[PDB]
Design a protein around this ligand. Structure first.
Ligand code: NA
Ligand code: NA
Lengths: 202, 202
C-alpha cells in the first residue's frame, strides 16, 4: 500500500500548491499520479483525509531530521545544541506541514479521521521537546519533581515554538528564527531555578 | 450602516457555531437577522468577508477589555500587572476570535479582503504588547537601543502568547493560562539584561 499512498500524496501536494484545496478534484489527483479515484478513496477515504495524511507525512519527515538526544553525536554537553540547530534549520525553511497542522487544528473538521492525525503529530512534538528538555536539569533532582518541571518547561517551549511559526508567516521579513530559538534556550535556563524553587511550595 | 452590520455578524456567529461554515448559507443568515441577502452582500461582499469581519469584531472587543498602559490605574509599578491580569482572564476564556484569526492566517484565502483584516488584527496585538513592554526596561536606556530590545521582547511575547492559545486548544485539561503568562513575564525579566548586553555588540 505504501508506494501508491506516497504517489497520491505527492500529486495532491503539488496540486494544492497550484490550485488550492477547493479547485483540486480527486480526478485532478488521478490525472497526476495515475491511480484511479476508486484506489484513492480506498486509501484515504476522503479529500480531507488526503490533506491530513499529507500533513502527517510532512511532520514525520520534519521529526526524522531532528536527532533524538540519544542519536545526537558529539559531547553530551553539546547534544542539546545539536538538536536545537537542526530545529532552527528546519523551522527557518517555514515548512508547509506546520501551516497545515495549525489550520487543521483550528478547523472544526468535517472528516472525523483528521482529529487523530492532529493529535498524533501534536503528541510527537511534545514528547520530542520533553526528551531534550530533561537534559537541561541538574541530575540530582528527584525524578517526580523533575517530571513536573520538565512538563512545564516543555509546554512553554512548545508554545514559543508554535509562535515562531506565526512570526515566520506574518512577519517573515523581520523574524530571525535562530535568534528566537536562542531566546527560548536562554528563557528555559533562567526558568529552571524559578520552577525548582516555586515547586518547593509543595 | 453599523447596526445592520452588528446584526448580520451576531446571526452568522450563532449560525456557524451551530452548523459550521459550509452549511451556513446567506439565506440562513437572512432568516436569522432579518436583512435581505442583497443587504448582506452590500456590507460584506462575500461569506468569507462576513467571517473575517466577525473575527475582527471579536478582536476589537478583546483588545478593548485590556487597558492600555496609560489607562491602567493604580501604582505605575503595578500597571504592568493589571494589564497582564486582564490578558490572563480573557485568554483563559479561550475566545473564538483567536481560532478564527489563526485559521484565516493559515488559509490561502480566496477572498482578497480577508488579508487586510488579518494584518490589522495582528499589528494591533503587536503594538499592544510593545506598549506595555516598553515599561519593563530601565528608564535610562538610550531610546534607539530600547526600540531594538523592546521589538525583540515583543516578538518573543507575541510568539509565547500565540502558543498559549494552541495549548488551551489542544491540551485544555493540562494548560494553566495564568501560569504560562507568569512564566512569560519571568522570561522577559530575565531576557532584558541578556538583550542589553548582546546588543552592546553594536
Ligand atoms: Na505537509
Ligand atoms: Na470572533
Amino acid at each position: 500500500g505504501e508506494r501508491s499512498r506516497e504517489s497520491i500524496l505527492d500529486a495532491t501536494e503539488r496540486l494544492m500548491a497550484t490550485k488550492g484545496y477547493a479547485a483540486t478534484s480527486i480526478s485532478d489527483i488521478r490525472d497526476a499520479c495515475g491511480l484511479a479515484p476508486s484506489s484513492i478513496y480506498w486509501h484515504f477515504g476522503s479529500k480531507e483525509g488526503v490533506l491530513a495524511a499529507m500533513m502527517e507525512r510532512g511532520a514525520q519527515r520534519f521529526f526524522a531530521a531532528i536527532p533524538t538526544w540519544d542519536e545526537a553525536h558529539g559531547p553530551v554537553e553539546q547534544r542539546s545544541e545539536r538538536q536545537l540547530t537542526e530545529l532552527v534549520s528546519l523551522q527557518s525553511q517555514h515548512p508547509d506541514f506546520l501551516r497545515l497542522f495549525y489550520l487543521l487544528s483550528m478547523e472544526r473538521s468535517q472528516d472525523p479521521a483528521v482529529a487523530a492525525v492532529v493529535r498524533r503529530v501534536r503528541n510527537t512534538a511534545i514528547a520530542r521537546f520533553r526528551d531534550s528538555i530533561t537534559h537541561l536539569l541538574p541530575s540530582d533532582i528527584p525524578p517526580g519533581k523533575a517530571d513536573l518541571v520538565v512538563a512545564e518547561l516543555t509546554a512553554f517551549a512548545v508554545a514559543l515554538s508554535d509562535g515562531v511559526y506565526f512570526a515566520g508567516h506574518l512577519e517573515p521579513d523581520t523574524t530571525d528564527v535562530e535568534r528566537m530559538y536562542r531566546r527560548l534556550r536562554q528563557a528555559l535556563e533562567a526558568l529552571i531555578p524559578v520552577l525548582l524553587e516555586e515547586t518547593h511550595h509543595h
